[PDB]
Amino acid sequence: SMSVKKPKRDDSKDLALCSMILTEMETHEDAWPFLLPVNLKLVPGYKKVIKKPMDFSTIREKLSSGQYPNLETFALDVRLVFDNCETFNEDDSDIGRAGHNMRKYFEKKWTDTFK
């Protein structure tokens, strides 16, 4: 509360480390469904159903331009990519499987780097 603070967690490396995690996600073989924004002209249903589209390129731009205030807002956008994928794709599809794999991969790197 006022004039009463928990000890300062060092956050000075967070930007660099989120950038490393994102690089690893970008270079995974199963990243291909997530590298670019879904083309809303060419994919029926996407625009109406997926209220907040997110992809890796868009995360990378946000990251590089100071649009994440902290490491939790970065993790929210990454999870959004996988939650959108589950909303629109069958579990038993190549894209559906890709999204499960990528989410598992991300969650391990996140825990190992920060928890």
CA distances 72 to 4, 34, 97, Å, are 23, 20, 25
Over the chain, what HEC string results? CCCCCCCCCCCCCHHHHHHHHHHHHHHCHHHHHHCCCCCCCCCCCHHHHCCCCCCHHHHHHHHHCCCCCCHHHHHHHHHHHHHHHHHHCCCCCHHHHHHHHHHHHHHHHHHHHHC
Name the resolution in angstroms: 1.8
CB-based contact 88:66 (threshold 8 Å): no
CB-based contact 31:105 (threshold 8 Å): no
Cα–Cα distance measured from residue 50 to residue 47, given in angstroms and rounded to the nearest whole number: 6
Elucidated via: X-ray
Domains of the chain (ranges plus CATH)? Answer: 1-115 (1.20.920.10)
- Orientation angle between helical segments 71-88 and 94-114, nearest 10 degrees: 160
